[PDB]
Design a protein around this ligand. Structure first.
Ligand SMILES: [Mg+2]
Ligand SMILES: [Mg+2]
Ligand SMILES: [Mg+2]
Ligand SMILES: [Mg+2]
Lengths: 376, 376, 376, 376
């Protein structure tokens, strides 16, 4: 009598022709490949500049809320409370705009499984609203950690070693939110909006590290954040956006309690040109058995997800880089172009998720790379 | 009684801390590693934007003319007539600013050679001055071709199959030069300066193709240039600059008439993420015997030289890219970041020469990649 | 027995905090200052880069269609067929993002007028859909002209001398639309998307000139467009956008058949720093009686509307400018920053509409400046 | 028996076609309009991006050192110790690249004066070298102040009310200089290079304010700098550059001890569109007797010199501006385009000096505007 599962994850990498193009998703729903009701996350690469004044993130979010609210017959607020819309801007270099759709299929009666291994589990969860004076600070850290521990448990992911990627959409500090904080008698972690994105990304990432036991609580405080880059998560991927003031989190790992045919793995890029780490992540998901991946192996890849940054020590493999003191082009623009190019050249596909700004996500100048792949 | 050589090439990849930093070169001359009198080409990657208003190209040129004129006790004009100063702007992504010094050692009495194979030959040559109405048109094509055929012969490179890289510094059309042409009763190939860079690069590249028998003269005319991308050289690398109105050419290949321990090889990148072509060029120079290069093999690499461009069909491996309709960041900026990232991740060194704009240099969206490497 | 009017225009300059901020408009409707049913045009300054990949134009359009469709209880398609959403990107320099709401109040029984003069008349009209091979060419010219003549008549604007500003939203050629045209056996006026914006703006502007008798039909053909800048309209203001393939036109002038207290006037800026033309337009609407406008006079200004461009001869008042060969910053970005700065410094308010790219709109390097002002 | 003078200043506004174009200056020397030996300052507007990676500043400096060293028969080091080469990058909007040449003619026997008034006095002076840990801090403040007080005295400028413009070239902190400071056991005022430019500009400006009695010493400390913008000089204009580690200062005012026909005046722009302050500065130098300047009056203007910045409160005349959270275009780029446009439209000439970044120079969001003009 076969083994059985109540839960199954599906993942779909969908090309987008511009920030408002929901048609690849509508096609899959129209064709019954996915059910709108089972979507839990839309993870976008939108082709704005990926920095402060990137409005394609909110544009794409709005475009998807309109589609899903009308497809599901609910309000835009409800759909927003039901699906995490996580839009990472900046599609530099060859990086192809797209979105990844995550679905969870829950069956009241179990459906039989064919292989005994663990399979992809994903669980979305939202934190409480933060006040602006909490952004970039320990209340964002610990609330995120609490949410991550909870999502793990509810997904039936056994322990932190089975978590391979935690994606967060986190707030940033606009000038208005800063004023709000001051007018109420508080300070903010920084008075520059662009810098606030790294603070928000960093604090969220350390929450993940805290939740997975990768850092000790007693080594964390406000003054560590964006400062002590010996502290980090190996699976954290955080993306700052203008819209919300809470954190939207999707935990991704493997679990025996899930059926289906997707698994996930990860490695740690030690820097932005560490293609060996890329091949190792592929290998862990059975997509690079030898030195170089084969075409069949690469056809199992659903998508690759990575974080990129300009090495803050100014160097890559003891060569000076120019990404940090370039007044025309922000460092994250450079960094995303690089890391997507490295991954694209290994998996032969520029349509992969690469998000900039990896404060406390991997080592400095590096970041996590995760692969979701089919088992056959 | 050993075989013998009159000619020997040396090549030195020198870090630069900013566009005026000649100190790495001064160090090698001060230490007697090279002789100022035997330098024939300084090939720079200067950290300006690499497009029209990139003044680091002329800055670096000026800085080197001052150093060499004073080191050689000649005027800046004479040093400029003696050394080709070929400055390719744009050091995007991880690309590390640097210059490559080429020297030719001529000995009246031959010096004995140890291995019988062909060795790196390089030969600099300048064309006549062009009028602005000749830029981007058949007189730039045929003069370049004549110069390339001559440089080959004088270098003792047996035939086109032994040429692996032809580097050109070519003019561009400023608004003043355009007016000059009109006031004299002529037209120009384009009235936009940035577009004129592709016309100048393209015409120069087809001269190289003509010289090496890669295209037929009867298939060339003005209307082909930047238009028919089925016509191209596999070894051409051309870089437009504001300074001169002639073409400065350095032909690089292998020859039995040269001693030393450097060889060169090349492959054709079919697109900007074609790392297999990169590994093939390494393999041809004995630096990638198996699937992945080893650390010893990579230590033989002196430098890698490549051309990069945004695929003009809008696509990379059937994925849409955004490089061509990005009003904030020029396509060549994107493309250089990509191709240097791909090469850097394979050879483990971001200090490599990657020049943007590959009209008629490789297939559309692609370009040549050449490696100069030590034989042991 | 007083004179009487069936028609009255209102205009409201509304600050926007970001591209999706419809709240200033919702406030005026909630308060009953305007009636949603009487809005005919939303003219936006959205804070994207104002060039090809400016997605705030469509974002803002989408945000307003959602608000109005839900306020009016119609579909987004119907609201789009009822209101012209004309979004001009690029808010450089001090230029403050905002929108201008235009309303037309029609009364079946006339309402009495107090002053006998002409008053602001505005009339929206849409052309037919264009095929991509018509963009930038005589069918866009003549269809626009037909639409302008019709809007004038239906508005009861007596003749071209009473037209002071014709605002158009016109298409641009994406790579897909170009392919469509070729696959059907046709050519396009240009194969570059950014250049296609000037072609679309130019053709639309000459339609306006044709309609108002400012150019002769026999002097127009495809080869004139973006080429012969002695041909132009003094009241045309055209803005290219990615969304539609028709032209949306709003004609603005003065008419005895309209009541209310708004008038409009215009002058022609001879170049981008022609503040005397700005003061002349103010004077024509009674807002600059002496050399310098007073605070009361400036308080009558509802908004100012202007076109800006980088002088294509490379010069402003016989000084070289750098706007055209700047690879980091598009010329229209520079030009909008300049012209808004000049106007803002004269009217003491950076919240004014300045749209880039004035092909055939005013003389080369110049453009129209119109003022809508209250009569007291 | 006439009054008499030992000292006379000349000023020449010279167009430049590119950063290396010294020919307008060579022409004036060749023609004997100026004597190379009497040049004390070359004040440039060079057409780089005016931020961190603007290499046209050093390029232009190098180009002028080569010309003058060879014209004067001295070394480049000596010419650099003899002339202040003050290169302000960024020629945005219509701003025309150019340099202003300042000369001082000293005569052992006095030359008779025709008018009794004060005339332009200018005095160059260099501070000591700073260590990087002194940049942006009180030792830069007080050394600058000492140098300013000394230059004033040696120029015979009676008191601070006769000083109208103090131009400084000040250092910035590269990553290397920061490391130097840390390795020696010290901190730096900031670890970002771009931010270090404002710290260096700010500290230098407060030195000027200290020297002229515009701020009290007891209100200054390190923590005030870039923080308390109620502290500022009304005549300070400071420009950060990569080259030196000292400050090069030129004090400009009026003095009875100077002959000639140039005077200088200044006003304080309260914000970036304060054209009334521009007209007031003109009026003080007899170039705007009525509301609007006349053509003859404007022909007396040799040049105008101003500082520009993006209002750090996010607003201009209670309108939101976008200059500070624009990741594509630095705020100083925007601000320079604006202020040069405002001045150009008033004096009818875009060739004027406008330098970005006015920390402690005028009120926040504003800056000084000075005019040097002929008396007839
Ligand atoms: Mg990291
Ligand atoms: Mg090519
Ligand atoms: Mg025009
Ligand atoms: Mg200030």
């Amino acid at each position: 009598h076969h083994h059985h599962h109540h839960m199954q994850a599906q993942v779909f990498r969908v090309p987008m022709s511009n920030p408002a193009d929901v048609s690849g998703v509508a096609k899959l729903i129209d064709e019954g490949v996915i059910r709108a009701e089972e979507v839990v996350c839309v993870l976008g690469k939108t082709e704005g500049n990926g920095c402060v004044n990137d409005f394609t993130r909110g544009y794409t979010t709005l475009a998807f809320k309109v589609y899903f609210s009308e497809k599901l017959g609910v309000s835009r607020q409800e759909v927003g409370e039901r699906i995490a819309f996580i839009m990472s801007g900046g599609t530099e270099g060859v990086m192809a705009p797209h979105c990844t759709i995550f679905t969870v299929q829950k069956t009241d009666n179990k459906q039989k499984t064919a292989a005994e291994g663990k399979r992809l589990a994903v669980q979305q969860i939202f934190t409480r609203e933060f006040l602006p004076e909490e952004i970039g600070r320990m209340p964002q850290v610990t609330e995120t950690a609490d949410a991550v521990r909870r999502a793990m448990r509810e997904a039936g992911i056994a322990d932190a070693s089975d978590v391979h990627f935690v994606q967060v959409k986190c707030p940033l500090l606009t000038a208005g939110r800063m004023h709000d904080a001051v007018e109420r008698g508080h300070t903010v972690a920084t008075e520059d909006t662009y810098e606030s994105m790294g603070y928000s990304r960093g604090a969220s990432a350390l929450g993940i590290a805290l939740a997975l036991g990768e850092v000790e609580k007693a080594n964390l405080s406000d003054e560590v954040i964006t400062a002590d880059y010996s502290l980090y998560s190996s699976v954290a991927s955080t993306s700052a956006g203008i819209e919300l003031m809470n954190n939207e989190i999707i935990v991704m790992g493997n679990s025996r309690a899930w059926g289906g045919d997707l698994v996930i793995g990860h490695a740690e890029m030690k820097d932005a040109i560490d293609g060996a780490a890329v091949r190792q992540a592929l290998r862990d998901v059975g997509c690079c058995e030898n030195d170089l991946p084969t075409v069949d192996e690469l056809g199992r890849v659903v998508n690759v997800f990575a974080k990129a940054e300009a090495s803050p020590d100014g160097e890559v493999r003891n060569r000076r880089h120019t990404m940090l003191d370039d007044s025309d082009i922000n460092s994250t623009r450079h960094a995303r172009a690089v890391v997507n190019a490295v991954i694209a050249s290994i998996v032969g596909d520029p349509m992969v998720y690469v998000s900039g700004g990896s404060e406390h996500q991997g080592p400095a100048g590096g970041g996590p790379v995760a692969v979701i792949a089919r088992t056959a």
